Design a binder for these strands. Structure first.
Lengths: 110, 414, 59, 296, 192, 205, 205, 198, 102
RNA sequence: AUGCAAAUGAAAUU
RNA sequence: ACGAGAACUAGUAAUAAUUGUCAUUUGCAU
C-alpha cells in the first residue's frame, strides 16, 4: 500500500518542512487521545465540532502558506476529512490518524 | 577286597606318579613315573594293598612286558582303559598336602572309593587341555565297563584275550541317557505369596530328585560315580556295560520308576531313558563316529518320547480335593490353608534351605523320594553323628575331552 | 553504537502483535520507518539486515 | 462342509491354568461346549447337533493367509527352527508334508508369524472390607490378547445340511455372547462370515495313507489297541470346572481327562466318542472326542 | 430367548483418568489412543447400584462365588474414540490428552513438591455397546429400570481417580434400543 | 442414596494468577483457550484454611492430620481410620455470557501487569511481566455432595459455609499478600440432583 | 484466628505516575479504563521504609536480609524459617466519588505534562511528555491483617502507623525527587472481619 | 533518621513565564484553573546554578557527572553508585492573601505582552503575544530534608543558604534573558517534624 | 458557517470586497470577550452596529450572517456555553472569509 | 511567529 | 456341559513462598 510514500517520494512539496505542520499535527494528536477516550464508536456532536474546527484550521493553514496548501491538496486531505465527518465512525478516524501519521513520518524521513 | 574295588582304587590312581615326577624334589625313581608312584604309595598303612600297587606300577606296555603277572590280573584292564581314555615347588606342596590327606583323611573300605574320587577332584582339578583328574576318572569308568563286560562274557584270560584291535572293535560299551519331561510347567506352577521361597525350593527339589535317581541307579548296578559323565537340567548321561544282565536290570529299574511316577503326578514329570551300543573304537575319535553315535542316541531318545503310555496305562489313567493355592495342581490332596502335603513339605524345605547346608537321604525324612525314601536337613555335627550327604558345542565340539568340557561348563554355571 | 534500549517500542509492538491485521502490519512498517529515521544505528540495523523486505514479504 | 471366519475387535482372554495366562488358539472342547451352551440357551433340540456335528479346533488367520497346526511327522535331515515353528501356512502345507520346505523358508515363515500381541492388565478388588473399613486392596493381573485388524480364528465343520443350517443359527446366536475366558468382563465378542476357500477345501479333499487329526480326539475302549499300532501323539491333561451342575463351583470340577493333541499322526482311523467326565452331577458333562482327519 | 443391543456415545465433560499404566493413562498399544476399559465401567456401576441399596445386582452382574451360581445377564465391552470427535480434533488441531502439573504443600515446613498427571481432553466422544441376553420374559423391564438408574447415577458421578478433586464427569448421548436376534420387541424401553 | 448439586458463579475481583503452566501464564483449556479455575486448588485452599481454623498442633502440622470434621468433609483415608471423601469439588469454566459481553465491548480476557523486583544496595530492578485474568470475568462452578450420614448434612453444610465465608476474605493463586487474586461468590444454586432428600432448608452466602 | 481489616482513602496531593504499562502511559485497568494503584509498589516502598527506620547493614543490604520484627510483619520464609506474612495489601482503584466529581465539573482524569532536559555545554533542549494523574484524585485501599500470635498485635500496629507516617512525608511512585508522588491517607477504619478480637483501642495515624 | 521541613514564600517581581502547557499559555491546575510553578523547575534551576557555582569541567559536562556536594545534596545515582537524594522539592501554590488581595482590587493574574519585532533591512512588524504571571503575587512552597548523617547537616544547610542566595540573584522560568524570572524569598521557616534532631 | 461564506462569493468579490483588516476591531472585540457582563454584550452589539456603519460591505456581511438575531438570542439565553458556541461560529466565519479572498 | 517529538539503566532464591 | 467363577488402578494431598516499574535528567535558546 504505502499510499503516503507515493506522494512524499513523488514531491519537497515546494519547500515543505516538518515544523510547518506542528499545530496541525498537534491538533490531530489531540483528537487522537480524545478519540481514544471515547467508548462507543458513534461520534458525539462535540467531537463532530472538533472535526469541523480541524477542517477550518486545515483551510486557514493552507491559505497561510502555499507549500502546505499544495501538500493538503495533493494528499487529498480535505475530501478525506469530509468523508470522515460524513461517516461518523471511530475506526475510520483511527485509520485516518494512521494515514496522516504515515505521511508525517515519511515527510520527516525525507 | 572285591576285585572290582581293586580295579577302582588302582585305576583312580593309575597315573599318579606324574605328580611326583614333575615335583622334582620327590623324584625317587627318576627313570619312570610308574616305579616312582609305586614307591610313594608303598609308604602308607591304609593303602597297603599290594594289587593296587601292581596296578599303579604296571599301566604301560614296557612295564607290563616283563612283569610276569597272572593271566587274570586287573592291571591289564587298566592298560586298555588308559589306551581307551586317550613351578616345581607347587608340586612338592601338593605332595605334602596329599600325604596329609592320605594319612588323616583317606581310608580303605568298600564305600570309600567315592572318598578317593572326592579328594582327588578337590586336588587335581587344574593339574594337566586335559587335567589329571579327568584322566583318572575316565580311565576308571572305562575300566569299570571293561571288567564288567569281560567277567559277564565268561572271559578271564585277559592277557591272552587282550595283550587287541578286534577287542577295540567289539561293541562292549553302552550309552544310556535320561530325560526329565516336565521341567517348565512343574517349575512355573506357582501363584502364592511365597513365590521366591517356593520357587527356590522347587528348583532344588527337582535337582535333588534327579541326583537321587542317578545315585540309586548307579548303586543298584554296582557301578561307581566315575561312569557318570553329565547331569543337569534334565539331561544326564551314563556309559554302562553292554551286557544282557545290564540291559535287563536297566529295563526293570525303568519299569519301577515309571510305575512310581505314574503313582505321583501322572503328567507333570516323567523320565525317559534310552540306550544304544557302541564299541571302544568309536570313543577314540577313529572316524568321528562318536558324534554319530551320540546323535543317534539323541534321535532314539527323541523318538521314544512319542509313544509314552501303553494301552493298559492310559486305560487306568482314564478310570479312577481342590487346587492348592501355592501349587497349581488339583490332583494332589490339599490340607489346611488349601495346601497339599508335598507342597507343604516344599515350604518346609524352603524354610530349612538358607540356614542348613547338608541334606540326608533316609527312611523317614521330610520330602518324598523315588525309591520309598525321604530327604531331610541336618548340620555337619549332626551329619557326623549319623555317619547320602548332598552339600553344536555339545555335539560337534572340536569321550574324555567332551566330558571335561561339560564339567568345565557345569562348574562355571555351578 | 546500537543499543537494545533504542529498540524498546519496536520490541513492545512485536510483543503486542505476537484485514485489520494487515493494517496492523502497515502500522508496524510505519513505526519501523519512523524509528529508522529517528536513530542512525537503528537505520543501519534495519536496512542491512533486510528488515523492510521481509516485513513486506510477510504482509 | 463350510468353514466360518471370526473377527473379534475386542480383547479376549483364553486361559490355560491361571488368570494371568493367555492363549491365542482354543480347542474344540471349549468351542463345542460353547455351541452346546448356546444351543441350550436357545432352547433348541440338541440331539441333532450332538451326535451329528463334526467340529475341528480353531486356527488363526491373517489378511489372506491361513494356518494349520504343525504335523508331528518324522522328517529325516538342524532340528531347531522346526521346533521354533508352531503353525504352517496353507500355501506350503504339502511342501512341508513332502519336505519341500528349507531352513531359510521356515525362518521366513516364522518371521511372518506376527499375528497379535499379549498383555497383562492390572486390577484391584474393592468389594472387600475397603467397602467396610481399613483394608488393603486385593490387586490381580489378567491376560488378554489383541489381534491386528486383519486377523482372527476360523473353524471347519461338516455334516448334513439340516445340521449345518442349525449350526448357522447357533453361530448367529453365539456371535453376541462370548467365546473366551473372562467373557462377561468385557472380553470376547465377534462377528462371523462364511467363506469357501478353494485351496483349503482341496486340501480337505485329498486321499492318502497317513492321517492328521485336526480336532481333540480320544479312541473308545475297544479300538485303541488297534489305533495305537504306529503313532506319534501328544497328551494334554484337560481339567477345569463346569457351569450349572451342582451347588458350589469350587466343589464341582471335571475329572481329569487325557487326550491326543492337534498335531498327531495315525495309521488306523478311529471314530471317537463324546465321553462323560461327570460325577456327583445333576446332568452329564460331555467332553468332545470325535476326529476330523486330513488324509495326506 | 432374544438379544437386546444398547448402543450410544458418551462425552468427556471434565478430564478423565483411568490410568492403569500409572502417572500415565490406559490406551491401546498400537493406536496409542485412550480407552476406557469395560471392567472399570462394570466396577463403578456395581459400586453405585449396590450402594443404592442384593439379588438384582447378582442377577445383573453375576457373582457365582457365594454358594450359588448365576450367569451374568449383561455384557459390557470397551469403548473407543468416535470418528466425529477424531476429525473434529484433527481439523481444529487439538491434542487428545492434557498434562496437568500439580503440587503438594507440606505443613510446618511450607515446601512444595511437584506432580505430573495426564487427563483426557474435555469434550471428546466415545462409542459404546452393551448386550442384554433375555433369559426371563417377565423381568427385563425391572432389569432395565435398574440400568436406567445406573446411567443416571453415573451421570452425577465420575470415572477414574482423583474424582473428588474435580475430574471424571461424563455424559451420555444418542441412546437407541434395538433387537437383532430373537423376536422380542424393543420399542418401549428407554435409557438416558 | 442422594447426591446434592451446588451450582453458582465466581467473579474475579482483582487479577487472578493460578498459573499451573509455569511468560508466567495461567492454566488454559486446549479446546477453547480460556481461563479455568482448577478444582484441586479450590479444594485444597479451603481444606488448609479450615484446618488452620480450629486447633492445628505442631504434631498435627507434621503429618497433615487434621480435625475430625474437616477430615469428614474432605476425606483423608490415609492410615488406619479410613475416611472416604464426601465432597467432589467440580471445576469452574469461563462463562459464555461474559464471552458475549466482552466480545461485543472488545475486551481481551487477559492483562499483563508489568512490575519491578528491586533489591537493596545493588538494588537490581529486574522488570517483570505477570499474566492475569482481567477483572469482570465470571466462571461457572459446580460442587457435588454425597450424604454418608443424613443427620450430619446440616453441620457439614454449615462447615462449608464458613469455608465459603473465609475464602471471601482471602485470596487464591499466588502473590497473595501483594494484592493478586481476590474473588467473590454469586448466584448460588443447591439441588439434590439424585435421591429423595429435600434441599430447601439450605442456603450458601 | 482472626483477620483485621484496615480501610481508607489515598488522596494524591501532587501528581502520581506509576507508568508500569509504558506517549508514556499510566497503569490502568481494562474493564473501565480508569487509573489504579497496585498493591505491589505500595508493599515494596513501605517495607524499605520500615527497614531503613530500623537497622540496615551492608551485609544486610547484600541479599535482602533484614531485621527480625520487620520480617515477622512482612514474612520471608527463606532462611529455613517459617514466616508467612501477616499483612495482605490490595491494589487501589479510582473511586466513584472522584469520577463523579470530575464528571460534574468537566475535568479530565489525566494531564500530559511536558518536560525539558538541557544538555551541558550545548544549550539544546530535549522535550518529553509524561502522563500523570491530575491532582485532588482519590483512590480506595484495603489492608488485611493476620493474627498469628495474640501477644504480637499492637507493637506491629505501632510500627505500621510509624510506617504510615514515613509514607506521609515521602513519595509513592516514580520521580519523587522532582515533586510528584506525595500522598495522604484519610478515613482509616479498623474492623475484625473474621474472629473474636476487639479493634477498639487499635489506631493508625 | 529524621525529617526537617523547609517552608517559605517566593515573591515574584518581574514577569514569570513557565509555559509548560505550551497562543503561549501557562501551566494550570485543573482543580483550580490557576498557574503553578513546577517543582521540577525550581530543582533544575537550583541544580544548574549550584553546579556552575562549583567545579564545572568540560569532561564532567560531557559525562553529566555532578559535583560530589551537589550529587549528594540532590541525588544522581547515575554512575552506578547508590545515591539517594537528601532533599525533596515540591510544586508551589498561590497564597490565600495573594488571591484575596488580587480579587478585592480587581487586578488580573496574567498580563498580555505584545512583542513587536523589527527585521533587519526590512522593518516588518509582526506582533507576537506572551502571557506573564502578575508581579506582586506570592507563592508558598515546601522542601523536605531527610537526615542520614547527624554531622554534615550544617554543611548542607549552609549550601542551601547558598542555593537560596543564588536563586534570588537569578531568573526562574522563561523570558529570563529579556527580563522575566526575578524572584525573591520571604518567611523561611525551619521546624523539624520527625526525629529528635532539630 | 462555511455555507454562508462560500455562497456569498459574487462576481470575484466577497461581500463586495470584504477584507479581514476591516474586521480587526470586531476581531479584537470578540478576542477580549473570548478570554472572559450583559452590558458587555450590549456594547458588543453597539460595536457591531458601529462596524456595520463603517462599511456597507460589513453591514451586508452582518445581515447576511443573521448576526443580530443570533446575538439577541445569545443575550436572551445568558448562557456562557452558548456564548462560546457563538465564538466558534464567528471564528469559522472569519476563517472562511479569509479563505475566500482576492 | 521560529527549533523542538523521547533517554538511560536494569526473573532471582526454596 | 468353555482354567470356570465373583474383582472401580483405589484413597489423601496444588505452582505454594520472598521480591517497589523504579533511579537521575529546567517548556526552554531567537
Amino acid at each position: 500500500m504505502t499510499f503516503a510514500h507515493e506522494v512524499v517520494k513523488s514531491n519537497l512539496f515546494n519547500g515543505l518542512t516538518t515544523s510547518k505542520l506542528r499545530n496541525l499535527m498537534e491538533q490531530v494528536n489531540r483528537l487522537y487521545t480524545i478519540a481514544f477516550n471515547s467508548n462507543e464508536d458513534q461520534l458525539n456532536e462535540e467531537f463532530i465540532d472538533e472535526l469541523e474546527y480541524l477542517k477550518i484550521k486545515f483551510y486557514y493553514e493552507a491559505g497561510r502558506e502555499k507549500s502546505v496548501d499544495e501538500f493538503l491538496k495533493k494528499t487529498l486531505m480535505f475530501p478525506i476529512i469530509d468523508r470522515v465527518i460524513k461517516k461518523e465512525s471511530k475506526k475510520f478516524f483511527l485509520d485516518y490518524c494512521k494515514y496522516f501519521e504515515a505521511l508525517v513520518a515519511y515527510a520527516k524521513y525525507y | 577286597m572285591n576285585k572290582k574295588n581293586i580295579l577302582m582304587y588302582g585305576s583312580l590312581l593309575h597315573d599318579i606318579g606324574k605328580i611326583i615326577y614333575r615335583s622334582g624334589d620327590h623324584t625317587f625313581s627318576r627313570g619312570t613315573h610308574s616305579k616312582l608312584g609305586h614307591q610313594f604309595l608303598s609308604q602308607f598303612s591304609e593303602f597297603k594293598d599290594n594289587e593296587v600297587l601292581d596296578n599303579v606300577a604296571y599301566h604301560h606296555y614296557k612295564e607290563l612286558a616283563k612283569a610276569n603277572l597272572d593271566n587274570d590280573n586287573t592291571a591289564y584292564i587298566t592298560y586298555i582303559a588308559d589306551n581307551i581314555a586317550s613351578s616345581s615347588g607347587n608340586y612338592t606342596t601338593l605332595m605334602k598336602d596329599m600325604s596329609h590327606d592320605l594319612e588323616h583323611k583317606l581310608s580303605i573300605k568298600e564305600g570309600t572309593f567315592p572318598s578317593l574320587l572326592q579328594w582327588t577332584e578337590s586336588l587335581w582339578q587344574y593339574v594337566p587341555d586335559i587335567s589329571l583328574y579327568d584322566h583318572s576318572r575316565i580311565t576308571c569308568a572305562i575300566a569299570s565297563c571293561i571288567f564288567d563286560y569281560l567277567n559277564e562274557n565268561n572271559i578271564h584270560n585277559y592277557k591272552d584275550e587282550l595283550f587287541t584291535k578286534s577287542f577295540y572293535q567289539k561293541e562292549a560299551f553302552l550309552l544310556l541317557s535320561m530325560d526329565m519331561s516336565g521341567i517348565q510347567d512343574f517349575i512355573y506352577n506357582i501363584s502364592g505369596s511365597k513365590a521366591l521361597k517356593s520357587l527356590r525350593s522347587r528348583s532344588f527339589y527337582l535337582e535333588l530328585m534327579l541326583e537321587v535317581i542317578v545315585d540309586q541307579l548307579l548303586e543298584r548296578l554296582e557301578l561307581a560315580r566315575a561312569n557318570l559323565l553329565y547331569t543337569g537340567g534334565g539331561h544326564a548321561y551314563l556309559l554302562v556295560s553292554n551286557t544282557d544282565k545290564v540291559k535287563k536290570k536297566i529295563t526293570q529299574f525303568n519299569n519301577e520308576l515309571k510305575k512310581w511316577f505314574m503313582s505321583e503326578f501322572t503328567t507333570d514329570l516323567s523320565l525317559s531313558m534310552a540306550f544304544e551300543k557302541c564299541s571302544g573304537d568309536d570313543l577314540m575319535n577313529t572316524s568321528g563316529n562318536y558324534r554319530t553315535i551320540w546323535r543317534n542316541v539323541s534321535s532314539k531318545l527323541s523318538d521314544i518320547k512319542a509313544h509314552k503310555y501303553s494301552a493298559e496305562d492310559i486305560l487306568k489313567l482314564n478310570h479312577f480335593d481342590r487346587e492348592c493355592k501355592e501349587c497349581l495342581r488339583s490332583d494332589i490332596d490339599i490340607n489346611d490353608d488349601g495346601l497339599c502335603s508335598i507342597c507343604e513339605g516344599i515350604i518346609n524345605i524352603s524354610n530349612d534351605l538358607r540356614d542348613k547346608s547338608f541334606f540326608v537321604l533316609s527312611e523317614t525324612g521330610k520330602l518324598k523320594m523315588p525309591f520309598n525314601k525321604f530327604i531331610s536337613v541336618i548340620d555337619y555335627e549332626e551329619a557326623e553323628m549319623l555317619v547320602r550327604i548332598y552339600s553344536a558345542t555339545f555335539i560337534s565340539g572340536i569321550i574324555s575331552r567332551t566330558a571335561t568340557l561339560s564339567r568345565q561348563l557345569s562348574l562355571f554355571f555351578k | 553504537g546500537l543499543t537494545t534500549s533504542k529498540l524498546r517500542n519496536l520490541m513492545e509492538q512485536v510483543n503486542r502483535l505476537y484485514e485489520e491485521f494487515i493494517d496492523e502490519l502497515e502500522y508496524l512498517k510505519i513505526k519501523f520507518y519512523y524509528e529508522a529515521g529517528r536513530e542512525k544505528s537503528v537505520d543501519e540495523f534495519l536496512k542491512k539486515t533486510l528488515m523492510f523486505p521481509i516485513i513486506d514479504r510477510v504482509i | 462342509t463350510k468353514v466360518f471366519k471370526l473377527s473379534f475387535k475386542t480383547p479376549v482372554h483364553f486361559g490355560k491354568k491361571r488368570l494371568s495366562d493367555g492363549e491365542m488358539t482354543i480347542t474344540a472342547d471349549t468351542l463345542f461346549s460353547a455351541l452346546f451352551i448356546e444351543t441350550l440357551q436357545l432352547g433348541k433340540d440338541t440331539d441333532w447337533l450332538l451326535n451329528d456335528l463334526i467340529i475341528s479346533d480353531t486356527f488363526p488367520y491373517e489378511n489372506e493367509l491361513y494356518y494349520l497346526p504343525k504335523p508331528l511327522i518324522k522328517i529325516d535331515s538342524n532340528h531347531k527352527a522346526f521346533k521354533k515353528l508352531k503353525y504352517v501356512p496353507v500355501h506350503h502345507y504339502n511342501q512341508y508334508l513332502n519336505g519341500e520346505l528349507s531352513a531359510e523358508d521356515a525362518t521366513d515363515l516364522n518371521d511372518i508369524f506376527n499375528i497379535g500381541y499379549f498383555s497383562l492388565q492390572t486390577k484391584v478388588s474393592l468389594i472387600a472390607q475397603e467397602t467396610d473399613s481399613s483394608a488393603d486392596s486385593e490387586p490381580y493381573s489378567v491376560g488378554t490378547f489383541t489381534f491386528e485388524p486383519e486377523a482372527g480364528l476360523y473353524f471347519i465343520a461338516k455334516g448334513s445340511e439340516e445340521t449345518l443350517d442349525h449350526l448357522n443359527n447357533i453361530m448367529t446366536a453365539l456371535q453376541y455372547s462370548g467365546l473366551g475366558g473372562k467373557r462377561n468382563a468385557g472380553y470376547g465378542q465377534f462377528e462371523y462370515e462364511i467363506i469357501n476357500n478353494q485351496q483349503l477345501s482341496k486340501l480337505l479333499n485329498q486321499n492318502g495313507k497317513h492321517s492328521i487329526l485336526l480336532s481333540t480326539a480320544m479312541a473308545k475302549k475297544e479300538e485303541i489297541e488297534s489305533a495305537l499300532k504306529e503313532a506319534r501323539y501328544i497328551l494334554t491333561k484337560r481339567s477345569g470346572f463346569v457351569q450349572s451342575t451342582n451347588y458350589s463351583e469350587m466343589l464341582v470340577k471335571k475329572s481329569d481327562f487325557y487326550s491326543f493333541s492337534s498335531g498327531s499322526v495315525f495309521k488306523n482311523i478311529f471314530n471317537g466318542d463324546i465321553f462323560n467326565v461327570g460325577h456327583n452331577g445333576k446332568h452329564p458333562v460331555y467332553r468332545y472326542a470325535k476326529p476330523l482327519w486330513l488324509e495326506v | 430367548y432374544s438379544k437386546i443391543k444398547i448402543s450410544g456415545t458418551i462425552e468427556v465433560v471434565t478430564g478423565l483418568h483411568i490410568g492403569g499404566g500409572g502417572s500415565p493413562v490406559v490406551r491401546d498399544l498400537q493406536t496409542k489412543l485412550p480407552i476406557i476399559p469395560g471392567s472399570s465401567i462394570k466396577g463403578k456401576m456395581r459400586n453405585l447400584l449396590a450402594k443404592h441399596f442384593d439379588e438384582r445386582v447378582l442377577r445383573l452382574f453375576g457373582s457365582s462365588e457365594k454358594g450359588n451360581i448365576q450367569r451374568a445377564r449383561l455384557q459390557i465391552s470397551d469403548a473407543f474414540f468416535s470418528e466425529k470427535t477424531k476429525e473434529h480434533f484433527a481439523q481444529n488441531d487439538i491434542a487428545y490428552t492434557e498434562t496437568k502439573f500439580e503440587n503438594t504443600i507440606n505443613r510446618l515446613t511450607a515446601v512444595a513438591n511437584p506432580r505430573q498427571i495426564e487427563r483426557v481432553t474435555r469434550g471428546s466422544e466415545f462409542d459404546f455397546v452393551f448386550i442384554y441376553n433375555v433369559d426371563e420374559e417377565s423381568q427385563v423391564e425391572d432389569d432395565f429400570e435398574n440400568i436406567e438408574k445406573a446411567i443416571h447415577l453415573l451421570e452425577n458421578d465420575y470415572l477414574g481417580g482423583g474424582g473428588t478433586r474435580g475430574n471424571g464427569r461424563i455424559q451420555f448421548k444418542d441412546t437407541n434400543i434395538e433387537t437383532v436376534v430373537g423376536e422380542y420387541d424393543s420399542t418401549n424401553l428407554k435409557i438416558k
